[PDB]
Each structure stands twice: as C-alpha cells, then as structure tokens.
Write a protein that binds this ligand. Sequence first.
Ligand SMILES: [Mg+2]
Ligand SMILES: [Mg+2]
Ligand SMILES: [Mg+2]
Ligand SMILES: [Mg+2]
Ligand SMILES: [Mg+2]
Ligand SMILES: [Mg+2]
Ligand SMILES: [Mg+2]
Ligand SMILES: [Mg+2]
Ligand SMILES: [Mg+2]
Ligand SMILES: [Mg+2]
Ligand SMILES: [Mg+2]
Ligand SMILES: [Mg+2]
Ligand SMILES: [Mg+2]
Ligand SMILES: [Mg+2]
Ligand SMILES: [Mg+2]
Ligand SMILES: [Mg+2]
Ligand SMILES: [Mg+2]
Ligand SMILES: [Mg+2]
Ligand SMILES: [Mg+2]
Ligand SMILES: [Mg+2]
Ligand SMILES: [Mg+2]
Ligand SMILES: [Mg+2]
Ligand SMILES: [Mg+2]
Ligand SMILES: [Mg+2]
Ligand SMILES: [Mg+2]
Ligand SMILES: [Mg+2]
Ligand SMILES: [Mg+2]
Ligand SMILES: [Mg+2]
Ligand SMILES: [Mg+2]
Ligand SMILES: [Mg+2]
Ligand SMILES: [Mg+2]
Ligand SMILES: [Mg+2]
Ligand SMILES: [Mg+2]
Ligand SMILES: [Mg+2]
Ligand SMILES: [Mg+2]
Ligand SMILES: [Mg+2]
Ligand SMILES: [Mg+2]
Ligand SMILES: [Mg+2]
Ligand SMILES: [Mg+2]
Ligand SMILES: [Mg+2]
Ligand SMILES: [Mg+2]
Ligand SMILES: [Mg+2]
Ligand SMILES: [Zn+2]
Ligand SMILES: [Zn+2]
Lengths: 50, 114, 149, 69, 91
Amino acid sequence: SSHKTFRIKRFLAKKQKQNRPIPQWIRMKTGNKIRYNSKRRHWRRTKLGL
Amino acid sequence: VQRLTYRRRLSYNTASNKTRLSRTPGNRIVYLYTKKVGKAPKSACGVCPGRLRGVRAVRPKVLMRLSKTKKHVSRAYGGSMCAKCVRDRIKRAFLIEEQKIVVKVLKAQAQSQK
Amino acid sequence: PGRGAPLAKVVFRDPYRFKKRTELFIAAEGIHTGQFVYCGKKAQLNIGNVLPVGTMPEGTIVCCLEEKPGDRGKLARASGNYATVISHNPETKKTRVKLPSGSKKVISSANRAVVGVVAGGGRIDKPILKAGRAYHKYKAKRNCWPRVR
Amino acid sequence: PRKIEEIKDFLLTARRKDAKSVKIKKNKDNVKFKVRCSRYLYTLVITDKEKAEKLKQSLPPGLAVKELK
Amino acid sequence: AKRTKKVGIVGKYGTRYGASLRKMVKKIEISQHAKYTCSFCGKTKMKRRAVGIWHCGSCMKTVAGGAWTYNTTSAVTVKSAIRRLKELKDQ
RNA sequence: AGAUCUUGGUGGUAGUAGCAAAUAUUCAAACGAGAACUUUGAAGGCCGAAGUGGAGAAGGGUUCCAUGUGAACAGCAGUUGAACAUGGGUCAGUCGGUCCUGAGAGAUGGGCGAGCGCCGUUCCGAAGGGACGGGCGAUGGCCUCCGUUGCCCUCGGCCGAUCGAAAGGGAGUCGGGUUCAGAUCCCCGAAUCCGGAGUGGCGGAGAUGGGCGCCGCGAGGCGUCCAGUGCGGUAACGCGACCGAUCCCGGAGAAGCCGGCGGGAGCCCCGGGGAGAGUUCUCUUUUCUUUGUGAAGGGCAGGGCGCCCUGGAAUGGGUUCGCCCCGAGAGAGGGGCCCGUGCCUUGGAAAGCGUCGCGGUUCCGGCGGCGUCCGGUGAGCUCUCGCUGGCCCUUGAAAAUCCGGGGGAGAGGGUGUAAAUCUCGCGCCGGGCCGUACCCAUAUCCGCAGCAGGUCUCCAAGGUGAACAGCCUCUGGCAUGUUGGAACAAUGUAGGUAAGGGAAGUCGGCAAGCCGGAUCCGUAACUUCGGGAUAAGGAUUGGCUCUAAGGGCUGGGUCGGUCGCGGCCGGCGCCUAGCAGCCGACUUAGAACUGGUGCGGACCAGGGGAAUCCGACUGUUUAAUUAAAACAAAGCAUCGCGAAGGCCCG
RNA sequence: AAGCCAGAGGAAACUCUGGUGGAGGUCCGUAGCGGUCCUGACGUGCAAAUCGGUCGUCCGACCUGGGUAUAGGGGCGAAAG
Ligand SMILES: [Mg+2]
Ligand SMILES: [Mg+2]
Ligand SMILES: [Mg+2]
Ligand SMILES: [Mg+2]
Ligand SMILES: [Mg+2]
Ligand SMILES: [Mg+2]
Ligand SMILES: [Mg+2]
Ligand SMILES: [Mg+2]
Ligand SMILES: [Mg+2]
Ligand SMILES: [Mg+2]
Ligand SMILES: [Mg+2]
Ligand SMILES: [Mg+2]
Ligand SMILES: [Mg+2]
Ligand SMILES: [Mg+2]
Ligand SMILES: [Mg+2]
Ligand SMILES: [Mg+2]
Ligand SMILES: [Mg+2]
Ligand SMILES: [Mg+2]
Ligand SMILES: [Mg+2]
Ligand SMILES: [Mg+2]
Ligand SMILES: [Mg+2]
Ligand SMILES: [Mg+2]
Ligand SMILES: [Mg+2]
Ligand SMILES: [Mg+2]
Ligand SMILES: [Mg+2]
Ligand SMILES: [Mg+2]
Ligand SMILES: [Mg+2]
Ligand SMILES: [Mg+2]
Ligand SMILES: [Mg+2]
Ligand SMILES: [Mg+2]
Ligand SMILES: [Mg+2]
Ligand SMILES: [Mg+2]
Ligand SMILES: [Mg+2]
Ligand SMILES: [Mg+2]
Ligand SMILES: [Mg+2]
Ligand SMILES: [Mg+2]
Ligand SMILES: [Mg+2]
Ligand SMILES: [Mg+2]
Ligand SMILES: [Mg+2]
Ligand SMILES: [Mg+2]
Ligand SMILES: [Mg+2]
Ligand SMILES: [Mg+2]
Ligand SMILES: [Zn+2]
Ligand SMILES: [Zn+2]
C-alpha cells in the first residue's frame, strides 16, 4: 500500500535490487556454469513472502 | 459540472473528515476541511440547561491561545456559572446564615429557664 | 444500561479532607434531584435515607439491604422490590427480615438499608410484544436471549 | 494581511526594523502602499493621487521602494 | 373526526400480537407517554425520560418513579407507612 | 509385460473440440519489410454522474515515467504492451503515523506449577525518586543578587507497568505556477500552531492621583503626608492586558436513531450585456462554451438564545407545518450574547481565466490590448448550520489534552519616569524520525490466469418522469471485452409472432401469456375492528386554443400657513365594503376544436376470485442439490438459588 | 396510530364531520443483502457453485469495513450436525 513501515520499505528495496539480470562478463569467467539469473521474480507471476 | 475529490488519504465520511465548498481565485471548486463546532460551557450549577454567554465557543485546545477576557465574564464565578444561579446562591447563603443566627438566638433565649 | 432500576448520583462531603465524594446509590422511588439524603445511625425515617436495620420499627420496609454488617447493599436491589423488617432482639443484635422471595432471614442489626421501595416500578407488566424488543433488552445484558430448545 | 487606516501609522510601520520592502500599486481608483513586515503585509489605500505622491517622496530611505507597474 | 373505534394508541401495531396483548399494553403505553402535573413547579411537563426516570421540562427536576406511571400505588402506600411509623417512632 | 505400479518421454484422438456473456464498427494518412488490431484525423456508436468518469483505504511492490528491442509472453496478430533491456522518479512543523484510550492484551507483587511456564491486573506489595514552598549549609559564579547542588521539614491516591485505532479523540496551510513521471511536500505569495529566550528584545498595562504647608500675578514648580495588584454598564455583559501557589469545583473533549421545518452555500434554471465558436436550402436579435477571489484579520448582513431591563396580562393572549409558551412574568418597547462557512474590505489582480495580437531565449512563469458585467427565481438536488419533536424493559464510549471559577498561602514599592506581574501589540530562534510514485480493478489485489466471481468508501450535469427507476444526451472515457473473413443448412442458446379452439398438453397452468401508471367513481364475506383493500368491478388519458382558481412587493394624504421648485410643525382630510402599480412560480379544474377511437402510444409498470392443510406475524436456516410445515419469537407454564448460594469453567 | 384545531349535535356523558399530525420489527419498490422457480444457460464451464430472467426483504432481530475474544473432543451455532 501507500502507507508502509520502514522495515517493509527496506525489504522491498532489497527485493528490487536483487531482481536484475546477470552481468554479461560473468559468462566469460573460468568455470562459470551459469547461464542466467534463475532467481528472477516478476511482480505478477509470483508474489513476495510478506 | 465539476466533480470533486478528497485532498487527503482519509476516504471515509467520518466525523473528522468533514469538508465545505470553496471557490479558489483560480475559478475552481475545492474542498476545505472544516474544524469541529465548538460548544459554549455549561453552568456548574447543573440545573438550568442553557450554555453560558460572553464566552466564545471553540474547541478545547483553541482556548489555550485565547485572551483571558474571551473566556470568562467579569462577575463572581463568571465563565463557570450563569448569573441567575449565582444570584440564587448568594441569596441562599445569606438566608441560611441568617437562619443559623435565628436558631442560635432562639436556643440562647430558650435556656434562660432551668 | 442492563438494569431497570434507575441509579441515583449522590454527593457527600468527605469528613476527613477537603473533597467531594460522589456515590451511586440505587434510587428508591420517590426521591428527586436537589433532595438531601441522610446516612447514619441517627438518620430519620424518610424515603432515601440510609440507617441500620436495628433502629427502625417493626413494620418498615427497605430498599438496598446489606447481607453482612459492613458490605454495601446486596438485597432487594432489582426494580420494584423491597425487604420488610419483621422483628428485633436487642440481645444477640439480630434482625429478622422478609426478602422479596418471601424467605425469612436473620441479619445483624447493624446492616444498613435505604428506606422505601426501589424505583423502576412494575416493569414486568408491559408485554414485550416483539422479538426485537427482547433482542434490544438482552443486547445490553449478555448473550443469552435466542434460546434453542 | 493588515489594513492601515491612516498615514501616521503607515509611516511608523515602514520605519520598523523588520520592514523588508514597500510595494506601490497604482489601481484605477486608488494607490496601495504595501510594506512587508516580519508577520504581516500592511496595506494603505490612498483614494486620491497627490497624497500618494507626497507619501512617495516622504518614504524613509534604505527601504526597497520597488514599483509594481 | 374519530379515527379508530377502540384501538386508540395501539393502532400502530396493526393486526399483530393479539387483541388481548394490545389491550393490555394500551393502558401502560398511555400512562407511559402521558404528561403529569409536576408537584414542584405546578406545570404539566413531567414526562418519562427512561424507565423509572421522570423529568420536568420547566424546573428541570428529575424524580425516580415507576416504569410506566409517575408513581406506583405500592410506593404511595410505602410512603404513608413510613410517615406513620416515623411519627409513631418519636413522640 | 503387467501391480488403476514409480519417474521420464511419445502417439491416435486431431489440425479436432474450441478461440459465441455485456449492440459496432468504417474511411484516409503516417511510421514500418510487414497493419483488421499501433498512432493521427474524419464518421457512426456505447458507458449515460448508483459511469466503462475523477480520486482514496486494504492488498500488490516498481507494475509509475522516458527511450530502445521484436527472441519468449500478451491462447489471432501487433510497428503495441502491466513483456524484455537501459536509465529516471516518491521532497512536509501545519497530510497521516507518532500521542490518548476503547473492546481487549499483558509484566511486576502474590499464587500455582515436576517443568517450559500460566493464573491473576488490583487482588495476600514498604507499589509515590516528584514539587514553585521553608530551613540547614557548601558561595560553585559578574562572591550586588539570582541561578547550582546535598540534607531536613511540609505537600503530593491516576490505587498502578506497558501495549492497543493510518475510519474513534487529537493545536496548527492555503492560493497560483511548475515535471516525461512529485507536490496542500518543490518555487512564488500570503498565513498559522507549538516550544524557547538565563544574560530580561521593544512598546503598552500595572501606574503613576489627592491633602497640607510654601514659592509663584495666574498657570506652574518645591517639601511632607496619604492612596494606588485596572476600568465601564441598572442588568444581561463589555474594554487590550488585568499579580497570585498547594488545594477544591466545574466545563470542553463527550456522544443513539428517526421525523418535520428554517437559514447559508455549491449545482441546476430563467432574462439580459460582452468574447469566441456552430447553423444559415429557408427561418432563427438565434444555438453552444465562458464570464474568479483561498486561508487568516476587520466591518456589516443574516440566523439563534431556556440571557437582561421597564411593565403586569381573562373579554385570556402570543404562536408553529406540527407544536408549544405565560403572575415561576405572556404580548409590547429597549438591550446583551453566540455563530457568522454569507457580503464588503486587506489579501486582489500583480495572480488566474477568456479572447485579439507582437517578438523571440532550438523548450520564454515572454510582451501588449480588451474583458472578467447586471439581474431574477425555487416544496428543485447535495452538503452544512440551527430550531423543535418522536422511539427505547435499547438511553446510545473512554482517556489524553485544554480551559474557567472558588480560596488567598504568598510576592511586590515607598511616591519612584517606581517594583512584583502581564492570557495585550510588535519583534528573534527552532520544529527531529517514518510513509508519500502508481493500480485500487471485466488487466497492477484474492480466486494457479489479463478468470463474466469476490473486494471498504468519497463527488455526481440536462430531458422525460414520483424518482439516485428505466430510456436518450453533455463533461470525462472506451473500442465491444483473449481473433477476424465469407455464408445464413440441421440441431441448439436468447428473443418475437401465429388463423380457429382455449389447459383438450402435463404429475402439476411448468413456461409463456393476461393485468399494470395516474385521475374519478365503486368496493364483499370474514375480522383480533387495526385490516381485508390497489378487494372485486367500471370510466377517462393525445395534440392544440383558451377560461377560471390558488401569491408576493411597494405606495394610499387635507394642503407654499412656505425657502430646509425642497425640508421641521400645524389650521390643514376621510382608503377604514380597501384600492393603484409592479413582479412571480408551478399546480388544479373546466370548455371548445381536432386526428383512420389513437392517446400511462417507447420506458416504467399488481392477473384476479372461492376455499382446504401448516406455521401466528416480522425474522433465521443446511456457503456447494432441501428456504420449509423446520429454528427463533412474544405469550404461557414449571424448576433451582438469599451469596458459606444456584448454574458453569478450571 | 396517538396528540391537536374548527364546525355541528347534545342536559350531561359525550358523539358526528372536515382538516392537521406522521406512528409502525407497516405495504409497493431502487441501492444493498438474500437466493424461489425456470428443476433455463453452462456443466473437460467465465466460474472446483457462475450467468440470464423471474423472485424475498429493503427503518430494522437491517447491511457492512477495521480492531478484538472464543482452538479441536475444543470453539461457535435463531439448531441445518
Ligand atoms: Mg494475482
Ligand atoms: Mg468567499
Ligand atoms: Mg424456544
Ligand atoms: Mg516396463
Ligand atoms: Mg507376469
Ligand atoms: Mg473448428
Ligand atoms: Mg467459436
Ligand atoms: Mg447511451
Ligand atoms: Mg471509479
Ligand atoms: Mg506504463
Ligand atoms: Mg499471440
Ligand atoms: Mg520488467
Ligand atoms: Mg500512588
Ligand atoms: Mg499507544
Ligand atoms: Mg482519526
Ligand atoms: Mg500524480
Ligand atoms: Mg475578494
Ligand atoms: Mg416578551
Ligand atoms: Mg488580468
Ligand atoms: Mg499519489
Ligand atoms: Mg474479474
Ligand atoms: Mg494462492
Ligand atoms: Mg458483440
Ligand atoms: Mg474486436
Ligand atoms: Mg479482459
Ligand atoms: Mg392462437
Ligand atoms: Mg385468437
Ligand atoms: Mg388434464
Ligand atoms: Mg392426457
Ligand atoms: Mg409461472
Ligand atoms: Mg381477497
Ligand atoms: Mg381532449
Ligand atoms: Mg412462517
Ligand atoms: Mg396460533
Ligand atoms: Mg442464508
Ligand atoms: Mg444449499
Ligand atoms: Mg436453494
Ligand atoms: Mg397460546
Ligand atoms: Mg417493512
Ligand atoms: Mg416489502
Ligand atoms: Mg438447471
Ligand atoms: Mg439429522
Ligand atoms: Zn444555572
Ligand atoms: Zn416542574
């Protein structure tokens, strides 16, 4: 909602910051074995824990 | 015609969410959030139901910034009780004190005989 | 709310410090605002006065009787009810009273009571006539009214 | 805002320490002198024009006399 | 003109609750909403505020009375009993 | 090889079912490789103010905004997207939280418990750590004298921690402008609340007068003495302040639902004057749009008063829609108070808006001209205020917080350009933390989803009409609800019609059909006398032209006997069966004429009667097969219990 | 419905008539709440209970948000397990 506490806002801030694609230079690292961010979250597909 | 919206996030028609209609210099109608209607004090006698005169009817916390004269009447018990019951109390006090004098004198003259 | 007997708000003077004490006596019927009510042993027999049962005559009836010598009023409190003083014995300091149920009780002569019948009159004569009136009656008391057999 | 009724009060109002600036507004019917104090904007209305002129040169110096026209 | 033959004040209840119950509540309701002559100021303004509470509009005197009448016959007999026992108690 | 075996993968079905709830799309152009779906323009429609409009609460959490991509997703497509990627965006003393308590939750003391712990919330507590007051002192120091500090005396029951509302209580911010996305928060301009000021910031108040001796022509000066914690009004009460503690009292906060009136505003309506548009085949001085003044002060209307003074009323009077009021003081006359959201004024026109232009700063809060005017209406609708009633075996919060009064413990100076003190005017400083974007729903929430479901509110135009009904339209919005094209087979779903008969169909008039609004008549049995009842039944209903009836404002003089073609008194006269003029809503009744007898012409909108059974009625019930005769109910009856108690939990 | 006014008739008791008034777990009927019938639609649905018309109530035992309390042999139940 528009009314929110500081802890909820901070939690949503962290959840925003980690919902981003992997950097391109990661895939050229030695022994990478990572293709894409498998922990990507969409606001309409899956909902947050709170 | 022009329809209206609340200017605050309180969306319910509660007692603290009362508005009036104002036309701005910009020629538009907006809500102005009014203050609650104050009440003049009731008399401390607790008998007659009318509220006191000469005292401005405002919210209780508005009384802190008012001058002294706006909150009382230049009379004994002024701003606390009505004039009529003050007159009644003055008469009652004087007459009951006189009655005490009368009964004291009556007993003093009654004890003159063994 | 929840009772049929009106309550009387009585203001006394504190005998030990400069203060006003406000009580919540049960209104004996016939009392009015602006009336002086006198509580004590040497109080006189008038409607609304509170005085011990031992000092009242053999046929007086009372309003708010004490079950024990020292607690507040406990008997004949419901509206329209009263208790009747029957007999005394100066020895053993006992008083026989007739409770509203008709039972006879022996109490201490020091038990205080209000002279007269409690206000609220004959409340049970009027038929309720409506399930809604009973609903509102028992809404102010407790959740007991709609009773399934 | 407060409305000054006569000239003498406006002169001593404009000489107060808090007086930031004075505004002169020429309307069709009157001339308004508007001194900006710490709490109020005191306005003096002058129906005629010659008295407005004498108050124009009699203003205390060191005060912004900015014209609204 | 006369509007009802016999129901009077209980005409608001319609056909409901039974004739005898309406007849029984009729007198209680007439006494309930009646205005009694105040015994303090002499005006006919004593009307019921709540059950057992009677208040006068003029002198603002509040009296504790009956549920439906200003005083019950029981309480009047009690007041007479108390006055006679008081005058018998002293001499 | 089996176990309706476990996991994974793949077939036929099958290019099949299907992409059919809520009326609808069409033309041209642009970008683009590509257009039924994107964008723009034109046209036709829909939502029709109880919206498909404009904003919020909960919930979501970046979905908001800009740019780009066309892999996957948006059950067709897409040049589009709530997709993907890259950047950006939420600014507060005065909007909320924060404070208060509510229903309640919950420590400590105590009790219980093997024990984690739980019972209890004032009950089995030495439960006040505070105080301007006075004394003892340390002089800490600008040691004058007031601020520090320790102890003692005196006073001190929130009698109980603490938590508990973004809808309750709760001081005080409004107007204009501005962005791609933020504003009551940013900028501009006007205010306001709270807290602070020790060295006291300025004024004003307190508060600055009489008496006696002298001097002095008088006025006026000198000395002494005495007052002086304000003043006015008969009163209601008023004035700009107006010494005062512990303590006490009171008020505000602080109160249900419904009815009927009245005042004010906003909107609606009508008549003109402007400005700009629309029509002009003919007519239309015509049709449409627009035509501001915030908070906060001052003044004035208006509304209200169960406020005061004079006076004393029956031949009772006053008065409301209703009421109701009066020797406990009517009517009448004169005052006082409260609210003042209305008008004027400061704010204020400089801003805003509407038009007509002129320069450019690639993208100016640019510059300029003109205007922003006069009126009338009302059972109109919505808010708000006020008055007065009705209902209750229902009586409709608490606490923070603020204020007034009683009392006078004390403090202040010796007549001084004075003191203590000040709720008066102005001045100086500060207001920390958190939230603030967006959606708020036939696509941003829940229902596995862009799911016909569910989800709390605010605002509310014109016509018809009783109406927030239904139907049409304006402001605003949208593209027909996850696809289109071509045909018009059966069967279906939804909607109509049907000659003659009229329930013969069927378990059963199921379904459909009939009736329906308003006016005028006229209404039975039975009945608990209230009802039945819109009983039943009958007539009328359009258009046009009139005719009556139902109101409100003013003014009615007999005149120069004269000078403030006008005014004071008076010789100077009989509207007194009331007239003259002006203005104004709708409503009712009647008449004539008239149309192919059609007229509540769409919409809205009871089929009726005679009985039997059951339940008295209103209400409730098996969410998702049973709404009933079941449950409840008032009424009636019985039982237990006087508190060391009845019933019950533990 | 009570209450009230006026007129008329009455010896009174009182009665009759016309207005006023606006009561009611009152009636028709929106919104809301509910869910009778078509045993309609749908029934691999829009929907793991919905949709259309027709319906019941619509000032009260009314509808509803939020905050609270009651927890499993327990709660709560105008009562249908
Ligand atoms: Mg979801
Ligand atoms: Mg205004
Ligand atoms: Mg029962
Ligand atoms: Mg195998
Ligand atoms: Mg085998
Ligand atoms: Mg197919
Ligand atoms: Mg299909
Ligand atoms: Mg339409
Ligand atoms: Mg909306
Ligand atoms: Mg977007
Ligand atoms: Mg697709
Ligand atoms: Mg994304
Ligand atoms: Mg204590
Ligand atoms: Mg709290
Ligand atoms: Mg609040
Ligand atoms: Mg915005
Ligand atoms: Mg203005
Ligand atoms: Mg009078
Ligand atoms: Mg201008
Ligand atoms: Mg917002
Ligand atoms: Mg949906
Ligand atoms: Mg889920
Ligand atoms: Mg269609
Ligand atoms: Mg389409
Ligand atoms: Mg959709
Ligand atoms: Mg046929
Ligand atoms: Mg036929
Ligand atoms: Mg047959
Ligand atoms: Mg057959
Ligand atoms: Mg049928
Ligand atoms: Mg019938
Ligand atoms: Mg005709
Ligand atoms: Mg029934
Ligand atoms: Mg029966
Ligand atoms: Mg149900
Ligand atoms: Mg069912
Ligand atoms: Mg069913
Ligand atoms: Mg019976
Ligand atoms: Mg009803
Ligand atoms: Mg009904
Ligand atoms: Mg079916
Ligand atoms: Mg069973
Ligand atoms: Zn009084
Ligand atoms: Zn009285």
